[PDB]
Each structure stands twice: as structure tokens, then as C-alpha cells.
RNA sequence: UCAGGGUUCGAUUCCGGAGAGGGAGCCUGAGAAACGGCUACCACAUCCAAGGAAGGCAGCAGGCGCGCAAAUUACCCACUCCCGACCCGGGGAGGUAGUGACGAAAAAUAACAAUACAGGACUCUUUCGAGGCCCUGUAAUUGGAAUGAGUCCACUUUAAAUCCUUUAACGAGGAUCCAUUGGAGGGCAAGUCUGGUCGCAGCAGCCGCGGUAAUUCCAGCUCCAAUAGCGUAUAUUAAAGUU
């Protein structure tokens, strides 16, 4: 409640605001750089990696399903990721030991919906898009 | 024929032995007028030969019928051959452009720099 | 159940397939906004106050 | 590298903040249907030029009466509204600029004037006569339906001189139909 | 970006600074501690007759590597300006064309009649019925007129060309000269249609849909929104009187 108002108080006002900004959760992680070292993408919107393994993860209650996912190793860091595969039957296009392009799931590093602990999704397989494969416009070259 | 010519913002230019003006051409229902038809009509205006007349830069307005360009008339052909730029003399046979490429000129220079004294064997046929 | 659980692509593979029944071209640009104006404002039939939407089926 | 080019340009409209407001959707469609426009962007252009006019008049109304800037820029803004026929000569003060509406500007388009002057049978036929080289303003063939007609330019709209209506040559349909009609007798 | 007060950004065409693989030393000159100058050490690396000799694209094009991520080894000094002993020679500075849905301005994809049925005014008539004048569609299908998108001759354009503007000859009945990207439970415009699946496959920013009669999955039809454009990931401003 008691804020100082005197005509020479500008050093107290300016430096107290500067000190109190560090209690905002969004300000702190943008300015310390610990989150930028921790993030498995080094500040990019997308990354390339190589498919290790295909897996099915159990959905959180109150609903019931097996959500189709992949485990992936990124090219530029060699660190490990798991990513969701959108649409009905798309896991049949993916194969193993080949390149995917991966993207964020839409919530800036947090998980989405009933899938436990998955932060990423697949968008391109062997330089062809999953949408162009799913709508029959293109096919995997072999 | 309907093709008609007018002249605008005219000046005599005693420092370059010429007179110079903007040229307006009216030509409704036809394509752009050839420069050979423009210069014989200007010759009939100023009562000169057409041989000392130079015209350039004609552009036609949207919807047609009117065009504008620039022109000059010299006091004699020996003043014209001194004062005109060489490309406008070449438009009607008074000058001839040299027929080497820029890269041929560049690379002959860089071969001459590797020899000293009477270098001509890298120049006449090298 | 037929085959195993956790089989991918099941329902898109089961579904019976039907060809397109369309033929005629739709309008474009100015002509489509002209058609929408005449259908929504110009000649109109009134109802009871529980007014009805453009895609009412039953 | 340095270059002799220039990079000045700007946008001429703004998008609305509520995408699906029912009260906004049918009001915009009624303006499209009454004036014979192509899309919503063609309405959002006219709302933006009016907003910039009212933003300037609301600034000049803060300054003292007979301030040198209020005298100079206020007389210029008022002359420029009368020149396009949007404002009445008998009114002529900043206070009446705040009373203008979008339908004052949509009425000054060449497409509206070709229909209202009786050269065409509908607001939809007028756009097609303009865009097909049939119409003339003073000496000049004009081809743009959103052209805004000045109050002294108003009495000089006409057909083109090289047009099948207006005194020119017949079109490519009437010429072919006459040709093949005479050919119906043989050897054509 | 923004009521007023602010928050975030600025490698990047103008101005100032620094540097030519990393450090150091120096010649010439009015001007350099210069790298399209030189000497040496340190890191790379080319040729050799093994004695020796030669090197610096963070200039313009072009290549490898990197990565989510960026164009042609084209033409010319005609323009703008600079250098020299010079009215005359030179310039990858600079200009021109190629690639280019980074991004901004303009703007097509149907107009109008006739005919049948349809809406509503208005008049004659108690009512029925008829006359009626101005607007909608849409089908078996009618009718004549207008035009550029394309093809291609000539002039104009320019250093020489291309493009734009100008102009002869061909060029439209719709079953093509065929508009797309996302949606239809709520927030939030738009189906309590019809077939398949059965807590499976899948959807879902968020709340939630699916366990044999699914407004939400997969498809057909119909409808909604913006439109030559529309969707998704990620940084950031407003909303945030949640600094």
C-alpha cells in the first residue's frame, strides 16, 4: 500500500521495478538463458532427426486409447525426443532409421490433451509431407 | 492522312550548333508512327533537308491516339557528327560499332601482363 | 474383434467407398456475392419467431 | 550493395477484430449488394480513408480558433472534400466533417455514376462496360471502376469513339455472323 | 505495436568505428602500421627431377561444409559518377536482363433479353375469380450482342534486346478458356440429414466426443467464412489495472 511519491524519488522507483520483474515466471526464463540451454531445439521452430523406435502410449483417464508415437534422435545435438503421428493409419508411412522433420505441439513446450509427456509432432517423412501422403497427392520414392 | 505533328517547349542552342524541342504526334486508329515519317514531316516544317534531323524517345499513352518524343536539328552534318553520341549516328549508317566481346578484351590484357618488351605475339594473334 | 488391438488404419480401411455425385460449376467473385445478396435480403418468406437457419434438415 | 531503387509503400485497409459478429456480417453484405462490389477488402478500403479524415479533423479541433496551423490545414481539408462532391459548399466547417458516412464516398465511384447517369441498365452492367474499354472521361479512355469523379469532371462521362456503341467498328461476333451468313449461299 | 502513459527491436542500402586465417614487425609516400604491398613465427595446404618454388573470395559469379533457413561461373560503360599525361583510355563501382507466393498497389472468372412457373403492391368483386406492375430463382432448354487470356505480323522501346503502351489477322455456350484453403456441440458464422465403426480406429489449443439408434471419428450430399489466396510451428506487441 505505501508507495513513495516525492519529486526526487526516481532512483527508488526505477530500481525497485527492476528488482521485482524477476518474480514474473515468463520474464525470468526469457532472460536467465537456462531455459535456452535446456530446450532440445536451440531456439528453432523445427528440427530434423532420425527414427529409432515406434511405440504406443496409453491415454490418461477418463478416456481409453493407444496413441501412436515415435522415438527420434536429433541431428544437430544427438539428443533424444518422442513425437506424435497425426491422422488415421499414418504410422504405416514412417518405417525405421530414416529422417523426419518435427515441430512443436502448439503450447510452447507443455504437453497437449490426453497424451502423457509428449511435447512434439511429426510433419515431414523422407522429404514428403504427411498431408500429401494421406490425401494421395504423392508417395514415398522407392 | 489524319497523322498530325506539333512542337512544344522549343529552344535554339548556339553552344551545340542545334535547335531542340519536344514533339507531339496525333494518330487516331493507327499503330505508332515510324521515325522516318516523323523526320521528313519536321524537314517540311523547318524547310531543311531531313539529313541533319535526329528524333528519339517516343512513348504512347493508354487508350492510344497520342504520343510524345524529343528531337534536334543541327546547323550542318559536320557539326552533327561531332556533337551527337555515337549510337544515334549508327541508327542510320554514319558510324560502325566494334565487334569484339568484353571477355576477349579482359583476357588479352591479363596475358600481356606476363611478358616484357615487344609483346605483340600476345596481341595480333594471341 | 478381428485381428489384434492397436492395429493402425482400421476404420479408414473398413469404410465403404463412394464416388462424387456433383456435375455443375459454381459462380466466382462478384457473381457469388450478387447471388448471396439476392437469396438473403430481396425475396424472403416469413415464419413464427423460432426462425430457421440456412441448412435445416428436419 | 547501394542501388538507385526506393522502398516506400503502405497498406490501404485494416481487418476487423471480431471475425464472426452477426451484426457486422449482414451490414457489409448489404453495402456489397447495393454498390456491386467484388469482396470484403473493397469495403474495408473505404472505411480506412474515412477513419484517417476524421482522425485529422479531431486533432485540428483541439487547437485555438485562428491558430495559424488550424487556419492553413483546415482550409485545405475542407477544399479537398468539396472538390470530389462529398461535402456541400454551403456548409464548409470542420464540425460537419464528423457527420460524414461511408455511403457518401461509395456514391462518387465511376461505376455508380455510369449506372445513375443512364449509360447502363444495372450496377452490375456498369462495371462490365467500364472494364471492357467502352467508356471515356473527358478525352481519356478509363478502365478502372473505383476511379473517383471530381465535381467539374462530372459532366464529361461518355462512350469511347472506337467502340461498337459510340460510333466505331462492329465487334468480332457481328462481323463473323454476317460473313458466314453470306457464305450460306456458297463460296464463303 | 500503441486511448493517454508505455513495451520490444535495430547484422542490413545514409553517417561514425573496426578487420582482411591468428599474433607481431616494416618499406614507400602528403596520407598506410596497407594485406588485389613485403618479412618472420603459429594453423592449414599446392607443385617437384626431393635440390627447390609458390599462397590468403568477410569483391562479383560459382563450389564444399553447416543447418529449419537464402538466386546466374549472363550482357554493357548508353545513364550516374570516379581515376590518369587525357574532349579520345579504364571501371563485376554502377546500370540491364534471369531466378523470386519476403512483402506492397490495381484487378477477370458473366452481362442482357424472351418464355413457363414463383413473391408482393394495386384495381374490379361480399367471398370465389380475373386484370395487373416491379423484383427472385431454376429446368426440359431458347436468342443475339460485348470482351481479354492465348496465338502472331509491324511500329515504338534500348548500348542491343525483352516487358509495358499502340495496331492489322485468328480466338467462348458452359458437359469449358472447369478457384482454392479450412470448417458445420460450445467459445464462434454454418446440419437435433443418410451410410460405416463400436472406449477400437481416431478427434480434441480449452471444456469435451467414441462402450451397437455418434449434432464431434471415416465418407456422400447440403451449408458457412475469407478469396488469388488459406492453414500450421516458433519469437514478439496489444488484450495485461496479470509489473
XYZ file of N, CA and C (backbone and C1' of nucleotides) in Angstrom, chain E residues 81-178:
686
model
P 25.607 12.942 -61.747
O 26.783 12.372 -60.809
C 28.172 12.563 -61.077
C 28.998 11.451 -60.412
C 30.511 11.564 -60.574
O 31.126 12.397 -59.604
C 29.793 9.344 -61.049
P 32.531 13.121 -59.876
O 33.629 11.957 -59.754
C 34.053 11.440 -58.509
C 34.946 10.195 -58.657
C 36.303 10.429 -59.321
O 37.298 10.914 -58.432
C 35.275 8.456 -60.201
P 38.537 11.785 -58.951
O 39.481 10.697 -59.654
C 40.268 9.787 -58.912
C 41.067 8.858 -59.831
C 42.005 9.605 -60.770
O 43.215 9.984 -60.134
C 40.860 7.849 -61.921
P 44.026 11.291 -60.594
O 44.653 10.800 -61.979
C 45.766 9.938 -62.018
C 46.157 9.661 -63.466
C 46.323 10.927 -64.305
O 47.569 11.574 -64.062
C 45.137 9.229 -65.496
P 47.756 13.160 -64.239
O 48.329 13.306 -65.728
C 48.941 14.517 -66.146
C 49.345 14.496 -67.627
C 48.139 14.306 -68.542
O 48.176 15.216 -69.632
C 49.886 12.752 -69.058
P 47.045 16.339 -69.825
O 45.876 15.558 -70.593
C 45.979 15.245 -71.971
C 44.835 14.341 -72.442
C 43.437 14.962 -72.341
O 43.074 15.629 -73.542
C 43.565 12.940 -71.088
P 42.058 16.869 -73.610
O 40.572 16.323 -73.887
C 39.674 15.951 -72.852
C 38.286 15.547 -73.396
C 38.332 14.451 -74.477
O 37.170 13.624 -74.428
C 37.308 16.384 -75.322
P 37.089 12.320 -73.502
O 37.716 11.151 -74.408
C 36.930 10.445 -75.357
C 37.767 9.660 -76.376
C 38.767 8.669 -75.766
O 38.864 7.532 -76.622
C 39.887 10.293 -77.072
P 38.062 6.176 -76.328
O 38.996 5.387 -75.287
C 40.172 4.718 -75.708
C 41.075 4.273 -74.541
C 40.391 3.440 -73.460
O 40.231 2.076 -73.802
C 41.693 5.140 -72.458
P 38.979 1.241 -73.261
O 39.142 1.224 -71.667
C 40.184 0.505 -71.033
C 40.175 0.694 -69.511
C 38.877 0.273 -68.825
O 38.700 -1.130 -68.725
C 39.682 2.283 -67.906
P 37.246 -1.780 -68.531
O 36.775 -1.388 -67.053
C 37.379 -1.933 -65.893
C 36.767 -1.275 -64.650
C 35.288 -1.598 -64.473
O 35.120 -2.883 -63.877
C 35.749 0.735 -64.071
P 34.178 -4.023 -64.494
O 33.365 -4.632 -63.253
C 32.159 -4.047 -62.793
C 31.425 -4.943 -61.786
C 32.192 -5.158 -60.481
O 31.226 -5.205 -59.448
C 31.831 -7.232 -61.607
P 31.597 -4.917 -57.919
O 31.849 -3.336 -57.768
C 30.759 -2.452 -57.667
C 31.159 -1.004 -57.384
C 29.924 -0.121 -57.503
O 29.092 -0.013 -56.360
C 31.756 0.883 -58.642
P 27.618 -0.643 -56.357
O 26.907 -0.006 -57.647
C 26.479 1.340 -57.695
C 26.273 1.802 -59.145
C 25.181 1.092 -59.942
O 23.863 1.530 -59.627
C 27.139 1.329 -61.255
P 22.576 0.585 -59.799
O 22.359 0.539 -61.387
C 21.832 1.632 -62.115
C 22.018 1.426 -63.626
C 21.187 0.301 -64.240
O 19.838 0.652 -64.511
C 23.419 0.164 -64.983
P 18.638 -0.396 -64.340
O 18.866 -1.511 -65.473
C 18.558 -1.271 -66.842
C 18.895 -2.482 -67.729
C 18.132 -3.767 -67.407
O 16.797 -3.785 -67.899
C 20.436 -4.218 -67.806
P 15.598 -4.503 -67.106
O 15.787 -6.070 -67.385
C 15.368 -6.661 -68.598
C 16.139 -7.947 -68.895
C 15.810 -9.131 -67.991
O 14.630 -9.830 -68.350
C 18.147 -8.913 -68.216
P 13.787 -10.645 -67.257
O 14.746 -11.870 -66.876
C 14.974 -12.949 -67.758
C 15.813 -14.041 -67.092
C 15.142 -14.638 -65.858
O 14.186 -15.630 -66.185
C 17.448 -14.221 -65.438
P 12.860 -15.834 -65.308
O 13.416 -16.413 -63.924
C 13.905 -17.735 -63.791
C 14.520 -17.951 -62.400
C 13.532 -17.784 -61.249
O 12.777 -18.943 -60.935
C 15.617 -16.729 -60.747
P 11.238 -18.812 -60.512
O 11.264 -17.793 -59.274
C 11.583 -18.196 -57.951
C 11.467 -17.018 -56.967
C 10.100 -16.336 -56.988
O 9.097 -17.128 -56.358
C 11.855 -14.733 -56.840
P 7.684 -17.441 -57.058
O 6.574 -17.027 -55.988
C 6.354 -15.678 -55.629
C 5.507 -15.613 -54.350
C 6.029 -16.555 -53.243
O 6.576 -15.869 -52.115
C 3.605 -16.561 -53.490
P 8.121 -15.428 -52.089
O 8.247 -14.527 -50.769
C 8.327 -15.098 -49.472
C 8.691 -14.049 -48.415
C 7.632 -12.980 -48.144
O 6.623 -13.350 -47.212
C 9.794 -11.986 -48.333
P 5.070 -13.093 -47.522
O 4.981 -11.507 -47.731
C 5.089 -10.607 -46.646
C 5.350 -9.176 -47.124
C 4.240 -8.532 -47.948
O 3.134 -8.072 -47.188
C 6.340 -8.076 -48.921
P 1.699 -7.834 -47.865
O 1.858 -6.461 -48.676
C 1.824 -5.203 -48.029
C 2.039 -4.033 -48.999
C 0.934 -3.844 -50.038
O -0.214 -3.180 -49.545
C 3.055 -3.683 -51.066
P -1.656 -3.416 -50.205
O -1.604 -2.574 -51.570
C -1.715 -1.165 -51.581
C -1.666 -0.589 -53.003
C -2.788 -1.054 -53.924
O -4.020 -0.403 -53.683
C -0.718 -1.122 -55.050
P -5.424 -1.116 -53.976
O -5.490 -1.299 -55.566
C -5.684 -0.201 -56.435
C -5.612 -0.659 -57.893
C -6.741 -1.605 -58.320
O -7.949 -0.959 -58.734
C -4.589 -2.329 -59.132
P -9.400 -1.626 -58.508
O -9.361 -2.949 -59.424
C -9.425 -2.896 -60.842
C -9.133 -4.260 -61.487
C -10.121 -5.346 -61.084
O -11.296 -5.314 -61.892
C -7.865 -6.124 -60.889
P -12.529 -6.302 -61.625
O -12.113 -7.592 -62.491
C -12.993 -8.697 -62.687
C -12.597 -9.496 -63.939
C -13.414 -10.768 -64.196
O -14.667 -10.587 -64.849
C -11.089 -11.152 -64.584
P -16.009 -11.207 -64.227
O -15.791 -12.793 -64.304
C -15.737 -13.509 -65.522
C -15.156 -14.914 -65.296
C -15.919 -15.805 -64.310
O -17.022 -16.499 -64.876
C -13.580 -15.914 -63.886
P -18.298 -16.937 -64.002
O -19.356 -15.785 -64.361
C -19.119 -14.452 -63.946
C -19.872 -13.392 -64.755
C -21.393 -13.459 -64.569
O -21.847 -12.142 -64.259
C -20.748 -13.424 -66.875
P -23.390 -11.773 -64.013
O -23.711 -10.838 -65.270
C -23.203 -9.513 -65.311
C -23.486 -8.800 -66.630
C -24.964 -8.667 -66.967
O -25.619 -7.620 -66.260
C -23.696 -9.320 -68.878
P -27.160 -7.744 -65.834
O -27.912 -7.831 -67.246
C -27.925 -6.711 -68.121
C -28.487 -7.057 -69.505
C -29.945 -7.475 -69.475
O -30.808 -6.356 -69.336
C -28.663 -8.785 -71.038
P -32.382 -6.561 -69.135
O -32.831 -6.936 -70.629
C -34.025 -7.662 -70.876
C -34.076 -8.153 -72.327
C -35.296 -9.036 -72.584
O -36.442 -8.289 -72.964
C -33.325 -10.107 -73.350
P -37.875 -8.593 -72.309
O -38.273 -10.001 -72.971
C -38.739 -10.077 -74.309
C -38.820 -11.524 -74.806
C -39.780 -12.405 -74.009
O -41.142 -12.250 -74.384
C -37.751 -13.552 -74.457
P -42.319 -12.482 -73.317
O -42.265 -14.061 -73.040
C -42.734 -15.001 -73.990
C -42.394 -16.444 -73.585
C -43.043 -16.877 -72.272
O -44.397 -17.275 -72.442
C -40.768 -17.601 -72.382
P -45.472 -17.092 -71.267
O -45.113 -18.286 -70.257
C -45.555 -19.612 -70.511
C -45.020 -20.614 -69.481
C -45.423 -20.301 -68.035
O -46.725 -20.766 -67.698
C -43.129 -21.001 -68.202
P -47.600 -20.054 -66.555
O -46.843 -20.437 -65.194
C -47.063 -21.685 -64.553
C -46.004 -21.977 -63.480
C -46.005 -21.042 -62.263
O -46.924 -21.395 -61.241
C -43.783 -21.434 -63.063
P -47.541 -20.273 -60.270
O -46.299 -19.779 -59.377
C -45.735 -20.584 -58.350
C -44.537 -19.897 -57.676
C -44.904 -18.597 -56.952
O -45.413 -18.812 -55.643
C -42.963 -18.280 -58.274
P -46.455 -17.785 -54.978
O -45.559 -16.511 -54.581
C -44.667 -16.541 -53.474
C -43.985 -15.183 -53.237
C -44.959 -14.063 -52.858
O -45.288 -14.042 -51.471
C -43.354 -13.304 -54.462
P -46.736 -13.561 -50.973
O -46.761 -12.000 -51.337
C -46.167 -11.037 -50.481
C -46.046 -9.674 -51.173
C -47.377 -9.063 -51.617
O -48.149 -8.476 -50.583
C -45.744 -8.834 -53.311
P -49.640 -7.960 -50.870
O -49.437 -6.571 -51.653
C -48.896 -5.429 -51.010
C -48.519 -4.338 -52.025
C -49.698 -3.507 -52.529
O -50.113 -2.471 -51.644
C -48.136 -3.969 -54.292
P -51.669 -2.225 -51.344
O -52.260 -1.904 -52.802
C -52.057 -0.649 -53.428
C -52.589 -0.663 -54.865
C -54.076 -1.003 -54.984
O -54.942 0.075 -54.653
C -52.803 -2.124 -56.665
P -56.474 -0.181 -54.249
O -57.182 -0.533 -55.647
C -57.465 0.460 -56.622
C -57.949 -0.176 -57.935
C -59.319 -0.853 -57.822
O -60.395 0.069 -57.953
C -57.794 -2.228 -59.041
P -61.821 -0.222 -57.278
O -62.430 -1.400 -58.184
C -63.118 -1.131 -59.399
C -63.622 -2.410 -60.091
C -64.571 -3.251 -59.230
O -65.919 -2.799 -59.225
C -62.999 -4.638 -60.369
P -66.754 -2.766 -57.853
O -66.871 -4.321 -57.458
C -67.770 -5.199 -58.127
C -67.589 -6.653 -57.663
C -67.864 -6.875 -56.173
O -69.241 -7.037 -55.869
C -65.946 -8.111 -56.922
P -69.851 -6.492 -54.491
O -69.151 -7.405 -53.364
C -68.559 -6.814 -52.208
C -68.419 -7.784 -51.025
C -67.391 -8.911 -51.197
O -66.084 -8.524 -50.776
C -69.443 -9.696 -50.179
P -64.779 -8.971 -51.595
O -64.733 -10.567 -51.389
C -64.209 -11.149 -50.202
C -64.571 -12.636 -50.075
C -63.986 -13.543 -51.169
O -62.698 -14.060 -50.844
C -66.319 -14.017 -50.745
P -61.542 -14.204 -51.952
O -62.101 -15.322 -52.960
C -62.130 -16.702 -52.619
C -62.868 -17.536 -53.685
C -62.181 -17.557 -55.054
O -61.215 -18.586 -55.236
C -64.523 -17.112 -55.295
P -59.769 -18.266 -55.853
O -60.071 -17.694 -57.321
C -60.583 -18.503 -58.366
C -61.130 -17.633 -59.514
C -60.088 -16.787 -60.261
O -59.430 -17.485 -61.313
C -62.007 -15.470 -59.712
P -57.975 -17.047 -61.834
O -58.217 -15.650 -62.593
C -58.782 -15.592 -63.897
C -59.219 -14.170 -64.300
C -58.093 -13.174 -64.611
O -57.618 -13.247 -65.953
C -59.714 -12.173 -63.180
P -56.114 -12.830 -66.334
O -56.083 -11.226 -66.209
C -56.610 -10.388 -67.228
C -56.649 -8.910 -66.809
C -55.269 -8.270 -66.602
O -54.718 -7.675 -67.774
C -56.741 -7.762 -64.782
P -53.135 -7.668 -68.041
O -52.493 -6.939 -66.756
C -52.542 -5.529 -66.567
C -52.028 -5.085 -65.177
C -50.581 -5.490 -64.850
O -49.537 -4.566 -65.142
C -52.067 -6.050 -63.034
P -49.240 -3.988 -66.606
O -47.832 -3.227 -66.419
C -47.699 -2.030 -65.652
C -47.013 -2.237 -64.286
C -45.619 -2.861 -64.368
O -44.598 -1.945 -64.743
C -46.894 -3.677 -62.482
P -43.118 -2.451 -65.102
O -42.452 -2.797 -63.681
C -41.855 -1.807 -62.856
C -41.378 -2.419 -61.525
C -40.275 -3.467 -61.691
O -38.974 -2.904 -61.821
C -41.975 -4.233 -60.169
P -37.709 -3.832 -62.152
O -37.443 -4.548 -60.742
C -36.699 -5.754 -60.676
C -36.833 -6.405 -59.295
C -36.231 -7.809 -59.300
O -34.822 -7.814 -59.134
C -38.387 -7.839 -58.302
P -33.942 -9.050 -59.655
O -34.283 -10.203 -58.601
C -33.889 -11.537 -58.852
C -34.363 -12.456 -57.723
C -34.142 -13.936 -58.045
O -32.866 -14.418 -57.657
C -36.392 -13.558 -57.379
P -31.647 -14.475 -58.694
O -31.034 -15.956 -58.634
C -31.552 -17.052 -59.369
C -32.540 -17.884 -58.551
C -32.849 -19.203 -59.255
O -32.034 -20.260 -58.776
C -34.847 -18.017 -58.802
P -30.712 -20.717 -59.560
O -30.678 -22.311 -59.360
C -31.835 -23.100 -59.090
C -32.831 -23.299 -60.246
C -32.188 -23.690 -61.570
O -31.613 -24.987 -61.534
C -34.287 -22.517 -61.792
P -30.790 -25.547 -62.786
O -31.925 -26.167 -63.737
C -32.436 -27.474 -63.523
C -33.538 -27.810 -64.531
C -33.092 -27.677 -65.987
O -32.336 -28.797 -66.435
C -35.363 -26.922 -65.610
P -31.693 -28.833 -67.904
O -32.948 -29.291 -68.806
C -33.236 -30.661 -69.042
C -34.413 -30.883 -70.019
C -34.359 -30.091 -71.340
O -33.726 -30.630 -72.497
C -36.510 -29.884 -70.309
P -32.156 -30.942 -72.540
O -31.486 -29.592 -71.976
C -31.252 -28.432 -72.775
C -32.495 -27.606 -73.176
C -32.066 -26.377 -73.972
O -31.669 -26.683 -75.301
C -33.990 -25.949 -72.598
P -30.978 -25.566 -76.221
O -32.228 -24.645 -76.620
C -32.001 -23.413 -77.268
C -33.295 -22.623 -77.464
C -32.974 -21.272 -78.097
O -32.959 -21.329 -79.508
C -34.323 -20.961 -76.166
P -31.608 -21.018 -80.308
O -31.514 -19.430 -80.114
C -32.428 -18.575 -80.775
C -32.242 -17.121 -80.351
C -30.827 -16.614 -80.603
O -30.629 -16.351 -81.992
C -31.743 -15.835 -78.513
P -29.189 -16.416 -82.703
O -28.613 -14.929 -82.540
C -29.199 -13.840 -83.247
C -28.988 -12.534 -82.474
C -27.550 -12.013 -82.480
O -27.362 -11.028 -83.488
C -28.448 -12.156 -80.246
P -25.903 -10.607 -84.000
O -25.170 -9.944 -82.726
C -25.287 -8.556 -82.452
C -24.875 -8.153 -81.023
C -23.385 -8.072 -80.689
O -22.711 -6.928 -81.213
C -24.707 -8.848 -78.828
P -21.105 -6.872 -81.338
O -20.591 -6.822 -79.820
C -20.620 -5.636 -79.039
C -20.056 -5.865 -77.625
C -18.580 -6.247 -77.606
O -17.708 -5.155 -77.843
C -19.822 -7.493 -75.994
P -16.250 -5.389 -78.470
O -15.456 -6.155 -77.310
C -15.037 -5.490 -76.136
C -14.488 -6.488 -75.117
C -13.241 -7.205 -75.601
O -12.108 -6.350 -75.512
C -14.750 -8.701 -74.477
P -10.659 -6.772 -76.052
O -9.999 -7.552 -74.818
C -9.685 -6.894 -73.602
C -9.301 -7.898 -72.502
C -7.892 -8.486 -72.632
O -7.499 -8.868 -71.314
C -9.493 -10.170 -72.951
P -5.984 -9.161 -70.879
O -5.788 -10.730 -71.195
C -5.452 -11.628 -70.149
C -5.439 -13.122 -70.503
C -4.394 -13.624 -71.501
O -3.063 -13.772 -71.027
C -6.475 -14.851 -71.617
P -1.821 -13.715 -72.041
O -2.081 -14.870 -73.126
C -1.845 -16.239 -72.843
C -2.331 -17.156 -73.974
C -1.523 -17.042 -75.268
O -0.350 -17.851 -75.252
C -3.872 -17.072 -75.721
P 0.988 -17.403 -76.018
O 0.582 -17.508 -77.567
C 0.501 -18.760 -78.235
C -0.067 -18.605 -79.652
C 0.816 -17.791 -80.601
O 1.847 -18.558 -81.219
C -1.510 -17.231 -80.845
P 3.312 -17.953 -81.452
O 3.082 -16.783 -82.530
C 2.868 -17.043 -83.909
C 2.405 -15.783 -84.654
C 3.391 -14.611 -84.602
O 4.442 -14.697 -85.557
C 1.149 -13.875 -84.188
P 5.606 -13.596 -85.614
O 4.992 -12.399 -86.499
C 5.062 -12.430 -87.918
C 4.483 -11.174 -88.592
C 5.215 -9.858 -88.328
O 6.445 -9.683 -89.018
C 2.861 -9.548 -88.365
P 7.577 -8.705 -88.436
O 6.953 -7.222 -88.446
C 6.847 -6.458 -89.634
C 6.136 -5.116 -89.392
C 6.860 -4.156 -88.439
O 7.902 -3.398 -89.047
C 4.532 -4.242 -87.942
P 9.129 -2.805 -88.197
O 8.515 -1.578 -87.364
C 8.236 -0.339 -87.991
C 7.420 0.582 -87.084
C 8.184 1.120 -85.872
O 8.939 2.302 -86.149
C 5.929 0.416 -85.298
P 10.245 2.680 -85.297
O 9.676 2.872 -83.814
C 8.934 4.015 -83.422
C 8.354 3.814 -82.015
C 9.400 3.623 -80.918
O 9.991 4.829 -80.466
C 7.677 2.020 -80.681
P 11.550 4.893 -80.100
O 11.653 3.913 -78.837
C 11.029 4.235 -77.607
C 11.101 3.107 -76.570
C 12.516 2.775 -76.098
O 12.861 3.522 -74.937
C 11.220 0.776 -76.604
P 14.124 4.506 -74.892
O 15.373 3.503 -74.844
C 15.800 2.855 -73.660
C 16.808 1.733 -73.972
C 18.037 2.174 -74.776
O 19.024 2.833 -73.978
C 17.118 0.117 -75.620
P 20.136 3.795 -74.626
O 21.185 2.790 -75.305
C 22.160 3.265 -76.209
C 23.083 2.155 -76.709
C 22.370 1.028 -77.450
O 22.180 1.342 -78.827
C 24.111 0.216 -75.973
P 20.818 0.983 -79.595
O 20.836 -0.615 -79.582
C 21.608 -1.350 -80.512
C 21.562 -2.844 -80.201
C 20.134 -3.375 -80.120
O 19.592 -3.689 -81.399
C 21.489 -4.198 -78.320
P 18.009 -3.672 -81.654
O 17.554 -4.929 -80.766
C 16.507 -4.860 -79.808
C 16.558 -6.119 -78.932
C 15.280 -6.389 -78.148
O 14.252 -6.991 -78.914
C 17.154 -6.663 -76.741
P 12.708 -6.644 -78.647
O 12.420 -7.381 -77.253
C 12.386 -8.794 -77.140
C 12.339 -9.235 -75.668
C 11.067 -8.814 -74.930
O 9.964 -9.696 -75.094
C 12.987 -8.355 -73.602
P 8.476 -9.124 -75.294
O 8.161 -8.407 -73.895
C 7.896 -9.150 -72.715
C 7.707 -8.229 -71.503
C 6.545 -7.252 -71.651
O 5.278 -7.847 -71.413
C 8.458 -6.149 -70.781
P 3.972 -7.374 -72.218
O 3.713 -5.887 -71.697
C 3.280 -5.627 -70.381
C 3.279 -4.124 -70.120
C 2.366 -3.344 -71.063
O 1.002 -3.312 -70.654
C 4.501 -2.267 -70.832
P -0.192 -3.348 -71.725
O -0.089 -1.927 -72.446
C -0.538 -0.744 -71.814
C -0.134 0.484 -72.631
C -0.755 0.559 -74.027
O -2.086 1.062 -74.039
C 1.576 1.065 -74.093
P -3.180 0.527 -75.078
O -2.551 0.831 -76.522
C -2.525 2.150 -77.025
C -1.900 2.242 -78.420
C -2.642 1.455 -79.495
O -3.844 2.067 -79.943
C -0.281 1.274 -79.762
P -5.097 1.174 -80.393
O -4.538 0.410 -81.686
C -4.372 1.073 -82.925
C -3.802 0.130 -83.991
C -4.683 -1.093 -84.184
O -5.824 -0.753 -84.957
C -2.367 -1.681 -84.150
P -6.975 -1.817 -85.274
O -6.387 -2.489 -86.607
C -6.745 -3.808 -86.986
C -5.976 -4.241 -88.239
C -6.263 -5.695 -88.614
O -7.370 -5.837 -89.489
C -3.925 -5.331 -88.507
P -8.630 -6.722 -89.055
O -7.997 -8.199 -89.072
C -7.604 -8.804 -90.298
C -6.923 -10.167 -90.105
C -7.761 -11.143 -89.293
O -8.783 -11.721 -90.096
C -5.448 -11.235 -88.664
P -10.078 -12.398 -89.441
O -9.473 -13.768 -88.881
C -10.094 -14.452 -87.812
C -9.234 -15.627 -87.354
C -9.772 -16.202 -86.046
O -10.794 -17.173 -86.211
C -7.447 -15.754 -85.843
P -12.194 -16.990 -85.451
O -11.728 -17.141 -83.924
C -11.203 -18.358 -83.415
C -10.682 -18.203 -81.978
C -11.740 -17.659 -81.025
O -12.715 -18.634 -80.685
C -9.683 -16.569 -80.659
P -14.110 -18.203 -80.027
O -14.072 -18.883 -78.569
C -14.517 -20.215 -78.320
C -15.724 -20.287 -77.358
C -17.021 -19.707 -77.940
O -18.170 -20.366 -77.413
C -16.416 -18.528 -75.998
P -18.784 -21.661 -78.130
O -19.854 -22.207 -77.066
C -19.495 -22.921 -75.889
C -20.723 -23.203 -74.994
C -21.926 -23.710 -75.811
O -22.777 -24.642 -75.142
C -22.366 -21.538 -74.831
P -22.272 -26.098 -74.700
O -21.974 -25.799 -73.152
C -21.081 -26.583 -72.376
C -20.785 -25.908 -71.026
C -22.067 -25.592 -70.242
O -21.982 -26.009 -68.881
C -20.587 -23.713 -70.285
P -22.564 -27.419 -68.374
O -21.511 -28.518 -68.890
C -20.471 -28.997 -68.042
C -19.570 -30.076 -68.677
C -18.852 -29.614 -69.949
O -17.665 -30.371 -70.156
C -20.613 -31.174 -70.451
P -16.278 -29.959 -69.457
O -15.864 -28.605 -70.211
C -15.767 -28.547 -71.625
C -15.155 -27.221 -72.109
C -13.735 -27.023 -71.569
O -13.013 -26.308 -72.572
C -15.115 -25.279 -70.843
P -11.417 -26.389 -72.688
O -10.976 -25.168 -71.740
C -10.712 -23.889 -72.287
C -10.311 -22.851 -71.231
C -11.430 -22.495 -70.243
O -10.900 -21.933 -69.049
C -10.982 -20.667 -71.663
P -10.437 -22.848 -67.815
O -11.792 -23.211 -67.046
C -11.732 -23.775 -65.756
C -13.122 -23.959 -65.141
C -12.987 -24.503 -63.712
O -13.668 -23.674 -62.767
C -13.964 -26.146 -65.268
